[model samples]
Target chain A: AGLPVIMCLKSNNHQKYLRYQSDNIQQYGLLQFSADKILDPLAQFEVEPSKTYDGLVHIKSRYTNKYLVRWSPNHYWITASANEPDENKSNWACTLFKPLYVEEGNMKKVRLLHVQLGHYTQNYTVGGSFVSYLFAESSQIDTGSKDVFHVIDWKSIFQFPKGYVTFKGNNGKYLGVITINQLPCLQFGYDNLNDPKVAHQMFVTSNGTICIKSNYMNKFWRLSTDDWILVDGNDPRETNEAAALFRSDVHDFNVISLLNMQKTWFIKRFTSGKPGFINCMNAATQNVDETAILEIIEL
Target chain B: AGLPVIMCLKSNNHQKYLRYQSDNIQQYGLLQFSADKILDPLAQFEVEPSKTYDGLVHIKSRYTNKYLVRWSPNHYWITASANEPDENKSNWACTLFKPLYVEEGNMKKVRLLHVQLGHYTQNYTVGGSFVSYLFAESSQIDTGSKDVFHVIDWKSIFQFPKGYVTFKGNNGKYLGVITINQLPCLQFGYDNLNDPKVAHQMFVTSNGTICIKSNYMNKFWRLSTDDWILVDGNDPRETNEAAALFRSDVHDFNVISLLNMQKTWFIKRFTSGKPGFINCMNAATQNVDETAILEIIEL
Candidate 1:
């Protein structure tokens, strides 16, 4: 994705959020060990996957607009803004970070590890006050205390109250619905991932069939013009609903095939690199099996 | 290490090895799901680091001497040995594997994930007896069944009972001792990692100081010829023991600095790509801080 992905962190020790204390004019860019439950931008972090290392990331603070960099061993992390001059170190090996993850009941928790220093990060105090800074300590250090935290998707804590789904393309845009003579056509037009009109709510049948209702329009989607064109309607009648029915084949992890075995066809996406109205058929003229890899993200 | 590192896998479901059943007359190259506890060559696996992936490895079975190739989705994992010449597939995208690890109290447990298929491997049975065949099933499949297992180091199960430590160079060889007027000088000469004479046992002080004892000779190693030459002695004298007392600065994960504050010298290794006897001194005239990165492996 071109736009950075956001994540919020809450430490296990004090159960407090990692706050970038921008309001403090004295220590304006201070990243404290422990903030707001509503998760303001000060507590938000933009994650960038490392190009050289898998499962490693570089974090940038949303409020400070700086990259987190560990300057030296046994030192607190400092943020780099557009310019830290007099910095002649070849590459920023200081920015690399790794995750030490563990499960918490049903949720996933993780302790962030600084790769260069080979240390686990946690909130701790020595002779000073306990409410403090994040320390890069030894793995065996802070044994009986806290290091792990709940890694929350920043989008999850958005203004939305109810759950909704979005069809995000490989380019990070959300699939939006556009009208063409009352025909609801899907296109990757929304840069905002959580756009209400672009996002959707999935309604499932008792027989495990799924029917998708477009959030932009007050209708359920169905096929038109002999199963070639995708359209929507009020969808109250069973005759109108049957054409909209889909069977989700759990093909890959979080990937499905929006299949309609009744018509021997599957809903395909982004045909010819432009639109997403291609339907499949092997029982007709040998449709390629590569098209129907359906992927949906929810928040 | 240039030479392939070895690991042996046993199934948690059947408590048996993943046998490369090579000796069978009919099913000669069959990779059965479940083998000998002694871990013969058939049960051994060589782990190759993937050029593009980290924590992901390419596993080669020793007996069949082939790469474990998952040819297609929902197909059996095939060994790329003599009998498999079916089609002209472009590049072997067939050989990537990843680790899905979780802690198991004292030991670490892992589930091997096939990257292309996005599945976990385990043995299963339906109508027939549950005796074998490793199946790459869905993450949610075989729930409450065995997919997690003990990942045993192949070196651990080798003939050595008492634990011993060896220092390995960047090249795949153990640090062996040579006799410089019977001084027991350390050098990267032994090809075998677990050579009995070269491996050492660490002795410790009550105040947490460490003294490494040579396994090849019955003696404690101490600085000789003015804290420059590392020599060993079975001396029954207090003067000799204090010179050997050292502290370990747990600087990195599995890395230490063989520090000695008394003489302000550390036993550094591989000074000029040949020898392992260089002492530290920032407390002296001048000593480079880069030399004392002590790394040790145990089995």
Candidate 2:
């Protein structure tokens, strides 16, 4: 009956959208164009104008149901986070934002501004590839598709958290552990969500790093001699290499890129063996196909 | 073109609905029906049926955008909390609730069921005035206006957070401090959000109980000799009486019941002078007015 209150920010770039991504920490990325509104729930954002500040508004992702915070100082990048009580008032920086709406010729565009960083969000070309960075005000170039975005009427199917997560590797198999030569190995538990060897469910620790606990061995995953080995340790400290970081794919939340500590490496290059093995020393932190897109399915 | 994506749950008793409240611990409370949907943003919940669970749905607060969790195991009750990865899988208990709809007389009544608790949410009679509680399955009654509710098409204006929170007491004044004859005292800092003595912004610590820092003395609020006093102790441990728990009023997110660590007891009575003094020892944890609804205003 009234004008739609929901809205989506479509970057001037092809059909990319500013969206909230899932993982250990809720991160934001550009969702490459998808037509199924039923599928892409993260793209929709609700805009709430400030009651205190004039000409200012807050854009919150319909997904996380939290504020789309920039330099809320949770991270250097933007995230969907709640305000924490900080005496230094570091979180005070994460209040309402400015949406500078101006028409570029006949096209409608809005420049999203970060008050604390004094930067505008934009896409910059690094060589032939592109990256979305909070472009500093001096570096904010409106080259049609860089920083400018389209505000379209948007509603959403917001997401909920489920416990007991399983990771399905890009290799058409579940990344479950199996014993080989009297030692635990990270092998393909292919087509075995039911198999005892395939039951790798992850749980997070106090420090936010994660550990995979096998339903069968009742052990945790640890990297020993550069290869993942199962251990009986339940709560591994951050000092322990058993801690893993799960970052979701930029375009797909169900798909994730697994990293070991902050090593900037990913699991890649599967070598031939009876039980099989993969090297974790792959320096492909970018869009390397070998880097596993471990699609996490919650059961 | 499409049916409304959002919906509001109204109780059969009257214009009451389920809502989320603001505090260090995000809790749920019932909202007395209001015509101003713009102001009553908390009442609108976006219902998302479980992607995995059949005949079950998860309701999320449009304001917080987090799941309306039941027995999410954050507390002993329901809350608006994100799922944390727990080995015990306590958070798994927080997901997907059943909204069972039935035709009750001339109206449609939906029974909001809590799976693990085996209870339905309803208005329970406590002497004369009523209270909303999760009625245990054996305790549930189909008494026309108790456990049943009405669902209607809805959309909402969501809310956001700000830094530097100040609590204004129900006494038509800001709950700030001033020193009379060298002792810091809790008094009516009336009509002065701009005054130095009216500067009572709060910050939370690891203990979750808060340490209210005054801008004037750069000190924190502590309970001494059964009265609130300002001391130079910052980051006071839970052992220190400075850690105050701020629980918001059930009907108003802006209003809070400031409590000491026990929280069962809250600050109530005020003594008069040029400035006034209030002490924390009220056992009226239930719905009682004059127990000080410290309406928190964010800067």
Q: Give the TM-score, chain B only, in order for the candidates.
A: 0.46, 0.44
Candidate 1 lDDT? 0.52
Model 1, residue A295: distance off in Å is 12
Model 2 misplaced regions, further than 4 Å: A1-4, A25-39, A72-76, A84-92, A104-108, A124-139, A155-299, B1-110, B113-299
Docking class of 1: incorrect
lDDT of 1 by residue, B203-252 (tens): 54322345666777767666555454254655313443445655444432
The RMSD (Cα, Å) of candidate 1 is 18.4
lDDT of 1 by residue, A9-48 (tens): 7777777788664331222243665674523335677778
Clashes of 1: 1
Model 2 TM-score is 0.29
Query: What 10-residue stretch in candidate 1 chain B is worst by lDDT?
Result: B279-288
Q: Looking at candidate 2, what is the lDDT of residue A299?
A: 58
Per-residue lDDT tens digits for candidate 2, residues B1-299, read: 11125666666665566555431111122122333332244566676666656666666556545554433122224544333212221333345566666653432457777654556766444333224433333336566556777666542212212346556666666655666556676665557776666665566432123556677777766555434444444645433442333322223445445544332245553553334344322333323356455666775
Over the full model, what C-alpha lDDT does candidate 2 score relative to the true structure? 0.48
